[PDB]
């Protein structure tokens, strides 16, 4: 029953290849799970190296041959637009769900029976999550907790030494842009900027913006305690006539004097700019004056500005000009003819940093910058890439907690406790079917792939860490107390995640469980593998 130039898998082979493919993808990405996981290398085929642990990066930048694993990779990657994290978790859950389902299918359990059991477990799992979570204090001033959130996110991605550097940077950068009166926040208010010639441990938080083009005169101020900012769109390069003209001279003296006569047009504009400076804290102590001109500035006029203790920047990018208007509070002057103090903004400490190859201008300490900058440093591409991802991952982790006050103790406490819950509730309720229970049992066991994979990577015995957690949980249940028990991936024994400071996000756990259940079900329900024209 087959047309030429086509192929199909009709018998159970369709399921074996779907499970096998998923098992492959699992066996790769499981090694990236947890702070003790390994680091994957990507080669772009052109000779460039990028290193990452991030599930989304691994799935979206690596090519996959197995058409079934492609479906898992895409569905898991979609989580990036929903939670921003948990991609590796989903792949691990899907793999083990298909492993456990396969074990039962071999016994004659129809894929539908497992699928329905998964849906029953999913609905009860969401109930468990809602009762398992802890409500976070609604105060945004809780820096101590927010550090724990950023730390937990960073430890997954960096070498744990950069965690000490990045943790306060992620925490304060997000809290700084967090709106007052307990409102929402947009983490796009934090600029992610890379620079070279410094070690990755030098990554730093900048209160304001950092500009690329600096001053180009040796007498430009190095640092000004407080300055007014002129936002100017008018070119200060040597101007020529707008109409047909020329320089007609009988002597070298007349030649240059005629050129100077046209140059006076720029000097007149400079006078109005300098006169403004003279009016607004002209000679006041501990004051200065900064120009961030959108257009070019003549080397002649840079000499003028430097002599007047003015820090003159030129050829600013639009993105900097628009942001600097917001940060400094000034307005863009389209014509020097209307120049007045009303144009000026204000900034605090303004200074330039000199790097072997580049200069960077800092416009920090503003009344309300409504923006932060993080400077990600390194000597290599892969070092900058890994650190950049670690910063963006932390910023999303903290922002998600500030938006969603629901926090869940981590270190596997959710997944082990949920597995125990489902096993008990299923027999207490019996609300599915005598055979459907096989799907729920498969689900409850599959949940343990996370605490098992987390510890497998740590190098501790996966069998003891589970038993130890079970022992402590049993004591809590017999004592009629609430106790959150996880695994300490540094010691190997159990721990209370709420003392260690290991937290998961509600959004991540909610969608990771729902997604993995759907993905595994979509593969289990596949009756035939069709191939035509390929």
């Amino acid at each position: 029953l087959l047309n030429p130039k086509a192929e199909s898998l009709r018998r159970d082979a369709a399921l074996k290849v779907n499970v096998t493919s998923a098992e492959g993808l699992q066996s790769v990405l499981e090694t990236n799970l947890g702070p003790k996981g390994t680091l994957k290398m990507l080669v772009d085929g052109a000779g460039n190296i990028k290193l990452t642990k991030d599930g989304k990066v691994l799935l979206t930048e690596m090519q996959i041959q197995s058409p079934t694993a492609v479906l898992i990779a895409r569905a898991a990657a979609a989580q990036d637009e929903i939670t921003g994290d948990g991609t590796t978790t989903v792949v691990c859950l899907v793999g083990e769900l298909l492993r456990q389902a396969h074990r039962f299918i071999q016994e004659g359990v129809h894929p539908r029976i497992i699928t329905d059991g998964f849906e029953i477990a999913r609905k009860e799992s969401m109930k468990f999550l809602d009762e398992f979570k802890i409500s976070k204090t609604n105060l945004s001033n809780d820096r101590e907790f927010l550090l724990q959130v950023a730390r937990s996110s960073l430890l997954t991605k960096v070498d744990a030494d950069l965690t000490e550097v990045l943790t306060p940077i992620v925490t304060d950068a997000v809290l700084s842009v967090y709106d007052a009166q307990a409102d929402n926040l947009d983490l796009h208010m934090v600029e992610i900027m890379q620079m070279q010639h410094l070690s990755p441990k030098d990554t730093t938080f900048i209160k304001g913006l950092v500009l690329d083009h600096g001053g180009r005169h040796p007498d430009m101020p190095t640092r000004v305690k407080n300055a007014y900012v002129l936002i100017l769109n008018v070119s200060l390069e040597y101007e020529k006539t707008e109409v047909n003209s020329g320089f007609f001279y009988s002597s070298a003296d007349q030649r240059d004097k005629l050129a100077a006569s046209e140059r006076k047009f720029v000097d007149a504009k400079l006078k109005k700019i300098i006169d403004l400076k003279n009016e607004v804290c002209g000679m006041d102590p501990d004051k200065g004056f900064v120009i961030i001109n959108q257009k070019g500035i003549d080397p002649m006029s840079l000499d003028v500005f430097a002599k007047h203790n003015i820090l003159a920047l030129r050829r600013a990018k639009r993105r900097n000009m628009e942001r600097l208007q917001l940060v400094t509070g000034g307005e863009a002057q389209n014509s020097v003819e209307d120049l007045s103090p009303q144009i000026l903004g204000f900034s605090g400490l303004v200074y330039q940093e000199t790097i072997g190859e580049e200069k960077f201008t800092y416009v920090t300490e503003n009344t309300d910058p409504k923006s932060c900058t993080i400077l990600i440093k390194g000597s290599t591409h892969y070092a900058l890439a890994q650190t950049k991802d670690a910063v963006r991952d932390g910023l999303r982790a903290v922002a998600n907690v500030l938006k969603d006050k629901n926090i869940i103790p981590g270190a596997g406490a959710f997944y082990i406790a949920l597995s125990r819950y489902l096993r008990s509730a299923n027999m207490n309720k019996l609300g599915a079917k005598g055979k459907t229970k096989t799907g729920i049992e498969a689900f409850a066991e599959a949940l343990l792939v996370i605490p098992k994979t987390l510890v497998k990577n740590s190098g501790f015995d996966p069998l003891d860490v589970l038993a130890m957690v079970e022992d402590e949980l049993d004591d809590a249940q017999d004592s009629d107390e609430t106790r959150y028990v996880g695994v300490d991936l540094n010691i190997g024994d159990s721990c209370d995640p709420t003392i260690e400071g290991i937290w998961d996000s509600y959004r991540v756990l909610r969608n990771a469980i729902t997604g993995a259940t759907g993905i595994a079900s979509n593969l289990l329900l596949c009756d035939e593998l069709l191939r035509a024209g390929r």
């Binding site: 790769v28 003790k36 390994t38 290398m41 080669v43 090519q63 070298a252 290599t380």
Partner: protein
């Protein structure tokens, strides 16, 4: 037919952790480890490099080799990038990172065979690194005081030149130290203003002769001849120098400006016009008192006739870098135009003459006991092509190392010749022994890697490592009159080539390493080793 499991990404054969990807990656690195292993030390080995363009060179420098090699395997690229880190903001340590990082991986494999995980090994290495970096702070004997004296410079320059060119160390040290002492200012305790760019010292070489006739010029040496009639300036001081970027010929026109001739009279009139305009431009130059003119471009016949009649030395310098460096000798600013070298843009040179070096004639812009240049030039000679080219590189390394003497305690000196490396073995081991649990396994092996230096130094010197190494260890494993070791902080490898036995005191030859170079290498080498160990799989994909 034959099935395969685990390979589902574009059909790639990509080894998992259980397949020994780490061990296989290290094996690839070992090929480069052995290549670099024989470079270190005053008796290091040469390598022949055949550039794809048909150029054959010989060098001792591992970094040169690594840049000339086409490095494909990512496991090696990690260490080659680490080498570049030693080149950025540091002038030494290339061999230290390549050799140490390889050995750290080699001993890691010995731990992997035990069943000790890459995570446990990396964690131990990070601890041993932090311990190592702290211990180095206490091994300082002397310190460079940044007085820029010739003799203080020689103390550092000599061991830096050593291991790139051996046997000529004292000659090359004088050449570098002299040139460095020329460009360095006289100052003490002044760290606010940076100075002494590596570019401040040029090296020039001519084929023929030998270093026995080498010298240092207080100024720049150009390979171009005095194109004009005047080949030299007088013995007077302060010859005014004009520098132009515009070619010394009739001015052009931005738009068209093409002259067409139809009548014989027009030919005569335009010919006189151009000659008068060029004269006016050459006259205005002479009228400012200019006695030497430097062009960034060619010179017209008429300009030569007028510049000759004005007695102005005509010297072409086509290199934009040489013109920028000329601003550091005479101070002149290149004129974007022609015929108006404003006096403020004129420079001053005491002497401009032609010199014969190696048989080749060059033009020299210099000063003697006055108006002293901010640039220096080192003059090399040698008849053998391969040897002279490498000697030039030795000069650059000396200058770069001096730059390493930077405000943040760059002058801290530690005993060299492996003496520091041997003491680290003892101290790091004790750190391991006091550390509970599996962490001690990697900390101890971390120490083991450090014997590669006294081993390599012995091997290159022709010594039997099986006698030198236990003698070095016994030399440091001694009884001292107190908790603090004194006399036996200085026992290093004796690079002599003698027969019987023994060790040599650092104090005998003032063999010291820079702390900044050592601590930097310790950071880079560990990061390179732990980076490779963290990679349990390599996957290629379209980006």
């Amino acid at each position: 037919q034959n099935p395969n499991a685990g390979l589902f990404k574009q059909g790639y054969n990509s080894y998992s952790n259980a397949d020994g990807q780490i061990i296989k990656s290290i094996a690839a690195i070992r090929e480069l480890h052995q290549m670099c292993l024989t470079s270190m030390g005053p008796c290091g080995r040469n390598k022949i490099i055949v550039n794809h363009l048909g150029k054959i060179i010989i060098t001792n420098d591992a970094a040169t080799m690594l840049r000339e090699l086409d490095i494909v395997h990512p496991a090696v690229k990690v260490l080659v990038m680490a080498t570049e880190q030693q080149k950025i903001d540091m002038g030494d340590g290339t061999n230290l990172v390549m050799i140490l990082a390889g050995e750290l991986l080699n001993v890691s494999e010995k731990l992997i065979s035990m069943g000790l995980s890459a995570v446990e090994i990396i964690q131990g290495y990070n601890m041993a690194r932090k311990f190592t970096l702290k211990e180095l702070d206490e091994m300082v004997v002397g310190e460079i005081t940044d007085k820029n004296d010739k003799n203080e410079l020689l103390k550092m320059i000599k061991p830096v030149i050593s291991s790139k060119k051996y046997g000529s160390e004292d000659i090359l040290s004088e050449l570098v130290s002299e040139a460095v002492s020329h460009v360095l200012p006289v100052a003490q305790q002044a760290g606010e203003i940076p100075y002494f760019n590596v570019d401040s010292i040029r090296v020039v070489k001519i084929m023929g002769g030998s270093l026995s006739n080498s010298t240092v010029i207080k100024g720049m040496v150009f390979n171009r001849e005095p194109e004009g009639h005047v080949k030299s300036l007088s013995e007077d001081k302060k010859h005014k120098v004009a520098v132009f970027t515009c070619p010394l010929d009739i001015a052009n026109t931005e738009t068209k400006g093409t002259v067409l001739l139809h009548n014989a009279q027009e030919m005569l009139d335009f010919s006189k016009g151009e000659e008068k305009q060029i004269d006016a431009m050459m006259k205005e130059i002479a009228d400012m008192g200019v006695e030497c003119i430097v062009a960034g471009a060619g010179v017209g016949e008429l300009a030569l006739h007028y510049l000759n009649r004005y007695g102005i030395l005509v010297l072409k310098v086509p290199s934009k870098f040489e013109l920028r460096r000329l601003c550091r000798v005479c101070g002149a600013t290149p004129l974007p135009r022609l015929g108006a070298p404003t006096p403020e843009e004129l420079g001053l040179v005491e002497t401009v003459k032609t010199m014969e070096i190696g048989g080749d004639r060059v033009t020299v812009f210099k000063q003697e006991q006055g108006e002293i240049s901010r640039t220096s030039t080192i003059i090399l000679r040698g008849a053998t092509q391969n040897n002279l080219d490498d000697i030039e590189r030795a000069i650059d390394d000396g200058v770069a190392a001096v730059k390493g003497l930077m405000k943040p305690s760059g002058g801290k000196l530690l005993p060299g010749a492996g003496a520091t490396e041997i003491e680290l073995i003892s101290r790091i081991t004790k750190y391991g022994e006091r550390t509970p649990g599996l962490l001690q396994l990697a900390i101890k092996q971390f120490a083991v890697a450090f014997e590669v230096v006294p081993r390599t130094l012995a091997e290159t010197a022709g010594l039997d490592v099986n006698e030198v190494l236990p003698n070095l260890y016994a030399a440091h494993n001694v009884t001292e009159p107190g908790a603090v070791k004194t006399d036996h902080l200085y026992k290093g490898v004796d690079i002599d080539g003698e027969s019987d036995e023994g060790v040599k005191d650092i104090r005998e030859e003032n063999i010291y390493d820079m702390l900044a170079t050592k601590k930097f290498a310790i950071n880079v080498a560990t990061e390179a080793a732990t980076t490779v160990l963290s990679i349990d799989q390599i996957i290629m994909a379209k980006k």
